[PDB]
Design an enzyme around this catalytic site. Sequence first.
Site, short mmCIF file in Angstrom:
data_model
loop_
_atom_site.label_atom_id
_atom_site.label_comp_id
_atom_site.label_asym_id
_atom_site.label_seq_id
_atom_site.Cartn_x
_atom_site.Cartn_y
_atom_site.Cartn_z
N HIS B 47 0.83 -1.19 0.00
CA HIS B 47 0.00 0.00 0.00
C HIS B 47 0.88 1.26 0.00
O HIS B 47 0.63 2.20 -0.75
CB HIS B 47 -0.91 -0.01 1.23
CG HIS B 47 -1.90 1.11 1.25
ND1 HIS B 47 -2.00 2.00 2.30
CD2 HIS B 47 -2.84 1.49 0.35
CE1 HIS B 47 -2.95 2.87 2.05
NE2 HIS B 47 -3.48 2.58 0.87
N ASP B 88 -6.08 2.12 -2.55
CA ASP B 88 -6.90 1.76 -1.40
C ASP B 88 -7.66 0.47 -1.65
O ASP B 88 -7.71 -0.42 -0.79
CB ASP B 88 -7.87 2.90 -1.07
CG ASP B 88 -7.16 4.11 -0.47
OD1 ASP B 88 -5.91 4.07 -0.29
OD2 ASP B 88 -7.86 5.10 -0.17
#
Lengths: 119, 119
Positions: B47, B88
């Site tokens: 991420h 995300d």
Amino acid sequence: DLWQFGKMILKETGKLPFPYYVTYGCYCGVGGRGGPKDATDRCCFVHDCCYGKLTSCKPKTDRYSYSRKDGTIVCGEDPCRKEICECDKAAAVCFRENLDTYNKKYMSYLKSLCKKDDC
Amino acid sequence: DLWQFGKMILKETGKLPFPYYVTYGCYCGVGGRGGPKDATDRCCFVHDCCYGKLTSCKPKTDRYSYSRKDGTIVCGEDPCRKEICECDKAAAVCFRENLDTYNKKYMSYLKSLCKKDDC
């Protein structure tokens, strides 16, 4: 219990721990490395000290007993469980009492602007 | 938006970011200081790299547009907003795909047992 603590926060402030408090200021959001930036930030510091005083307890794993049916957190009835619960209560109440000055600009604040109080 | 990201996590895994992921393993829960302990832990690393590639964007403050009416996250329609949204999405999906091995013992894991991969 770390989960119970997060609910008290949600219930008392109407805000979810993440990202509002897990990433706030210099203490709550920086592992407690920097000095508190404001009152809300200081709540986390006061919370750690509260746990610090519970040597024989496991403040992060023990699941205590509490209720908030009528708007006020009331810790049920283990000496450790109760003490842990009080610490959590106090902090949730601390975040609440200081919503008046909560700064969204301190959310995910930057470490390089942080400085550094001891329990 | 850091809030939108937390909802995707909640919606995709049925777990609230805090304390399940904000305090998990050596990466997610240690600021990304230590090396990933397992697959879920690695999701956080992947991420950060995703955000790392978005230099001109503000991955933490920009509020994008997404929907999950029918069980699958679909990013609405700003080049930055969309890219941020994908990052995300991927991570929420990553946490989900790895629920099979999520370890609760790594929750609030200890830094001293952590070691240290580069994007």
